Amino acid sequence: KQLIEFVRWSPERAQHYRNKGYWIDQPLTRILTVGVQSHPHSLAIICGERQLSYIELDRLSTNLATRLAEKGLGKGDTALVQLPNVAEFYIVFFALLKAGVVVLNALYSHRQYELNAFIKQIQPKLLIGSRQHEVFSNNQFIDSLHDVNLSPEIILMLNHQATDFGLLDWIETPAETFVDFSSTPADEVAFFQLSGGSTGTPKLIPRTHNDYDYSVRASAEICGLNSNTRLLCALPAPHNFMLSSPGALGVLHAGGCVVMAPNPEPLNCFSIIQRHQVNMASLVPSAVIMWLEKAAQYKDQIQSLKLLQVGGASFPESLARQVPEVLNCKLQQGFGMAEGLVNYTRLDDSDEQIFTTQGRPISSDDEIKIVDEQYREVPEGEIGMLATRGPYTFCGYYQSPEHNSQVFDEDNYYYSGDLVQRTPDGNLRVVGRIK
Ligand SMILES: Nc1ccc(C(=O)O)c(O)c1
Ligand SMILES: [Ca+2]
Ligand SMILES: [Ca+2]
Ligand SMILES: [Ca+2]
Ligand SMILES: [Ca+2]
Ligand SMILES: [Ca+2]
């Protein structure tokens, strides 16, 4: 009965964000619904040899949602999902959003310790994973949960065994009996994001439909997505970068197509890019270097690339200038965080801006503060600590009142720990990290 707890925006701000059009109080399923009404047959996801249209995605995620509601799973409940970069990931995501289950998506590289900390935290009633994952190769992990009354009520397995509940079986056919189900309220938690750079296990970040949808819609505008965008998803699908800035959600919002790749392996990525004429991709600097090493020998397979998003680490100007030259495509530099703030160079910015800065905030109502150790605003140009608050920046970690009072100040600015400086053109440059 009780919806998931989280820290809220002040009503004064919540009104402002509604008045400005940022929060439109719609569930994240809006992306699916709106898509099925306009272009039900456009391809939504390409995965290997499979072609999922928008209405194909809608029907499949409904089948799963009706069977979860049939089992009594809905509002108030949580789910732990750990799937690889395949179409099933997005079916599950939209299926849980439809059913009102707050999902935490672990990284497919997370091992037993991390998954254990997540379960002890959200106490999920549903667990979706892969039998091909090391943790679910045997039954030791699933068994250890019973000893601590943390075992879930429903466990679905991809690449399942005869005994297991086949995830693909629950997706193909809907349930026999009818049960009503609905998303959580737009201004309530939709799912959990995972912090990056956390010393211990990643901390939980509650994302509501209102704020996440906004970052998706705004990211899509600044990154130029449209119904012809074919975006390669080579990074980990659950990551904020690959999902919402602009990510798969931004592409679907624009009526485009998501092309799945197991990882950013140059040769495989290059082949997928040529096969499906991928015209956009999003990478971290380490993967870009991998692509740069192989590009010259495979210029033809990657001709169709039109725009590359690079963010998430140091990207020196000497590397930036190689993207257009070697990868034959435009460069967009970004700097974001799962906690909220997302920065991007604009597609019309100068070459000096694109090649030596990480852009500027998505929202004109993103409030930025650059301070020193005496928590005072530094003179424009100098390096300082980044504090921010906006219409898509969280207001505190899940069930972490001690930590939250350390990273949030009285005015509720969030201190990312990132060191930055504001260039004359107004753009930000990320120059280091602090702790
Ligand atoms: N747009 C982006 C880029 C990078 C990150 C990141 O935290 O790695 C993000 O959360 C958003
Ligand atoms: Ca099909
Ligand atoms: Ca559109
Ligand atoms: Ca090109
Ligand atoms: Ca060239
Ligand atoms: Ca951080």
Author numbering: 3 to 437
Give the text the authors published on this PDB structure:
Acinetobacter baumannii produces the catecholate siderophore acinetobactin to scavenge iron, a nutrient essential for several metabolic processes. The biosynthesis begins with BasE, a standalone adenylation domain, which activates and loads 2,3-dihydroxybenzoic acid (DHB) to the phosphopantetheinyl arm of the PCP domain of BasF. Adenylation domains have two subdomains, a large N-terminal subdomain (Acore) and a smaller C-terminal subdomain (Asub), which is highly dynamic, adopting unique conformations to carry out each individual step of the adenylation reaction. Several binding pocket residues were identified within 5 Å of the ligand, including Asn242, Phe243, Ser247, Val336, Val344, and Tyr346.
The V336G mutation further expands the binding pocket, showing improved activity for both 4-fluorosalicylic acid (∼9 fold) and 4-methylsalicylic acid (∼89 fold). This mutant also had significantly higher apparent kcat/KM for 4-azidosalicylic acid (∼40 fold), a trend that was not observed for several of our other mutants. Although the V336G BasE enzyme was soaked with 4-azidosalicylic acid, weak density was observed for the azido group of this molecule. As the azido group may be flexibly positioned or has the potential to hydrolyze to an amino group, possibly promoted by the reducing agent tris(2-carboxyethyl)phosphine (TCEP), we placed 4-aminosalicylic acid in the observed density, which fit well. We docked the 4-azidosalicylic acid molecule into our V336G structure, which showed that the ligand has the potential to bind similarly as our expected pose, with the azido group pointing toward the V336G mutation. The binding pocket of V366G showed an even larger expansion, which provided further space for the azido group of 4-azidosalicylic acid, resulting in the near 40-fold improvement in activity compared to the V336A mutant. When comparing V336G structure to the other BasE structures, we also observed the nearby Tyr346 to slightly turn toward Gly336 as a result of the extra space being present. However, the conformations of the remaining binding pocket residues were maintained. The V336A mutant bound to 4-methylsalicylic acid and the V336G mutant bound to 4-aminosalicylic acid were used to compare with the binding pocket volume of the WT enzyme.
